[PDB]
Design a protein around this ligand. Structure first.
Ligand SMILES: C/C(=C\Cc1c(O)c(C)c2c(c1O)C(=O)OC2)CC/C=C(\C)CCC(=O)O
Ligand SMILES: C/C(=C\Cc1c(O)c(C)c2c(c1O)C(=O)OC2)CC/C=C(\C)CCC(=O)O
Ligand SMILES: Nc1ncnc2c1ncn2[C@@H]1O[C@H](CSCC[C@H](N)C(=O)O)[C@@H](O)[C@H]1O
Ligand SMILES: Nc1ncnc2c1ncn2[C@@H]1O[C@H](CSCC[C@H](N)C(=O)O)[C@@H](O)[C@H]1O
Lengths: 395, 395
């Protein structure tokens, strides 16, 4: 596509974005990246990919060590000049201004008349969960990507056979243990990971939002407390950010909300008297203990496991399902391989770089659910959202 | 700026780009990046910065090990499917398709009906100098950026005092020697660097192009073979790509073209009977041996050196200058600190990450030239071009 036609497509998406159509924001972003790619000469592609972005990642990482985004957030509309910010961060003024000016050039913060100002982005990055996301990605994920060329050359350009212990993660970090075992052994990155799970897709429409999955019609309609008093179990739900969002959207709840994860995750949940869920320890590789709930929900859980393990994770729900009553709700990326998109290839390579795993096509998921004893009822998607919602049931 | 106003600015730049105005291509790219930044939520910024781009750098690096861009270039409009390309590259078909699909999603190659196709970008990246640029950046530059957070935390957030031996480069690569000494000791990266110098700003208007520096009026007009038969000396000109471009644009030449660089650079220049320059060894830290030439040109040379060394590099030209006749032409970035731009902060952080050096403001350069014994005549710039052209003369 020529730049001329992409300029037209971009103008068309801007109209849809002004009219507030679903997915138009993401489409406008996608047209902009296509436009850049159609105009950039290879030397500019080299500079952006290999200079601007590694420098940007490093400075953003450095920002979380010196409290930079928090200070700019506090300054609000007044901002701070380099001398004030260097003094607050304990940095050489000259060094600080050079790093800050790259953030300005990358559109992360703004600058006017020698004063630096926070932005919606940088103010958002000031939050603790984004701070820990940045540290995790730069300290843990980045070296694994850096190891891809040499790891795959050494392994003969093969897909990791075991996934767990024979991937680029193990080579980058010079261990022979799995990524989950590495996290348990390497504080503070396990708790950084748990904060990260509330940030990696934040601000995107959730499965239970309007026009995505019909929660009311499929779950609340026909809820039967005589079958079970449990409305929804979130299997592997982290610190509970997804299940809490569910409860706030469908209150008063007709039944209980049960969060299931690892003990170290459950024990890190901060106290809250307004909590609408019960936090419980469960191992996804044992049989589901909550029997006959109206819904079992998983989000980004079996995508981190090979086929044999994914089948076990789904099969372990089967003994708990009430026939004709219990829904299985799998919130995962469904890869369309004829239409590759960043949101799907991103997570795919993240799975390869940490778990040695992969994102799956619709035929892939159907095969896994069938081997588990489940059958697909319907698959729901939403424009601009990475994940689909697969509703399954007892085969 | 709201997205609405940026959409308007983008439409205005597209008109200027259609009318072929100078710098309009770069301006259109800049508006697109601003638009993306105004629409992206922080989770998408995290995914792009810390997932998409490190993965993209790694795959592009892997591509140079398996000859991928060259194969797609050879396939021309027919393209290749994953099975054909995996067979040619010696890669697992599944592994290859996942990596290739990320290149498609990042707009580096295209895909239709399961067939992958080269692009202007990927076909350009197939050239040997871009191949070696990619290896240099991923193997040498990338680790240095990755070391920024921990290096500056360890050094108290100070500008490298010596620059040469006390910077993030030394920490990333675990040496105590300077970057130039490291290159000499680490084949093949020195010759990769020399290929890289012909790629890092290729495709951009040169200083001697129309509407930039008036070569004809300032140099050719008034050329005097009785003063010297040398028209232009390129001091530190690499393998000669800049001086060869000069000769092809201003032929028949009234005087000689002299290239000066390190012996290992001169000795790597491939033979060419149509060569219009004389390749000669010279050390920029000794007095200029070519006396009274019409012009002495440097491009991206003193920007890699601290103030004391930059002064010496410029002062070493002074004994060779013919008063009233010899021009000094310094082709370097001139940083406008009130208006930060990617092309200037990019190179600034590259200087920090390799040389422990920095890009300079106009007042910075004037101070250096004055201490060297030179005075500025005029400074020329061009829309969208990173470097300016400072014409100096004997003070
Ligand atoms: C499915 C898993 C990880 C797979 C994954 C993701 O699901 C998501 C969304 C992201 C990444 C990731 O690796 C990532 O890096 O960014 C986002 C399980 C990882 C295991 C534990 C933390 C348990 C440790 C214990 O034993 O207690
Ligand atoms: C000014 C120097 C480097 C400074 C620099 C650049 O001028 C440019 C354009 C780039 C980088 C860079 O480091 C870079 O990384 O990307 C582009 C001199 C480096 C020394 C030698 C190669 C001599 C070795 C011997 O002794 O023979
Ligand atoms: N064996 C196991 N038993 C229970 N939970 C597990 C588990 N292995 C991994 N998990 C959990 O699976 C989750 C995967 S990350 C996804 C978290 C959350 N559902 C979200 O999308 O935001 C983590 O919370 C992790 O602790
Ligand atoms: N002491 C020295 N004497 C001569 N040349 C030197 C030198 N130190 C570094 N150089 C040269 O300075 C150049 C800097 S990189 C710039 C290369 C070229 N002018 C371009 O812009 O494309 C390299 O070619 C390097 O070999």
């Amino acid at each position: 596509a020529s730049p001329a036609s992409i300029i037209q497509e971009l103008a068309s998406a801007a109209k849809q974005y002004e009219n507030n159509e679903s997915g138009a924001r993401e489409a406008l972003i996608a047209q902009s990246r296509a436009l850049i790619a159609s105009l950039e000469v290879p030397s500019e592609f080299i500079q952006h990919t290999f200079w601007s972005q590694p420098a940007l990642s490093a400075i953003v990482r450095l920002a979380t060590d010196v409290n930079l985004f928090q200070y700019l957030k506090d300054a609000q509309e007044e901002g701070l000049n380099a001398e004030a910010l260097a003094s607050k961060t304990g940095m050489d003024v000259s060094l600080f201004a050079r790093l800050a000016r790259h953030l300005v050039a990358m559109n992360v913060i703004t600058s006017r008349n020698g004063v630096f100002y926070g932005t919606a982005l940088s103010n958002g990055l000031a939050a603790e969960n984004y701070q820990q996301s940045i540290r995790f990605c730069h300290d843990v994920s980045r070296p694994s990507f850096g190891a891809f060329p040499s790891f795959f050359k050494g392994n003969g350009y093969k897909t990791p056979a075991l996934g767990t212990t024979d991937g680029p993660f193990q080579s980058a970090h010079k261990v022979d243990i799995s990524f989950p075992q590495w996290l348990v052994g390497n504080p503070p990155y396990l708790q950084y990971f748990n904060s990260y799970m509330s940030a990696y897709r934040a601000g995107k429409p959730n499965w239970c939002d309007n026009g995505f999955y019909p929660v009311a019609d499929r779950l609340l309609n026909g809820f039967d407390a005589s079958v079970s008093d449990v409305l929804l179990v979130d299997v592997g739900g982290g610190r509970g950010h997804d299940i809490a969002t569910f409860g706030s959207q469908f209150s008063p709840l007709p039944g209980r909300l049960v969060l299931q994860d690892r003990e170290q995750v459950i024990n890190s949940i901060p106290a809250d008297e307004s909590r609408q869920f019960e936090a419980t320890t469960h191992d996804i590789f044992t049989t589901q203990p909550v029997k006959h709930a109206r819904a079992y929900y998983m989000h980004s859980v079996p995508h981190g496991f090979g086929d044999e393990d994914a089948v076990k994770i789904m099969a372990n729900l089967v003994p708990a399902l009430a026939k004709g009553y219990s829904r299985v709700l799998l919130n995962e990326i469904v890869v369309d391989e004829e239409r590759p998109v960043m949101s799907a290839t991103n997570m795919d390579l993240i799975m390869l770089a940490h778990m040695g795993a992969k994102e799956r096509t619709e035929a892939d998921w159907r095969s896994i659910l069938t081997r588990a004893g489940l059958k697909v009822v319907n698959i729901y998607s939403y424009p601009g959202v990475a994940e689909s919602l697969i509703e399954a049931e007892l085969a």
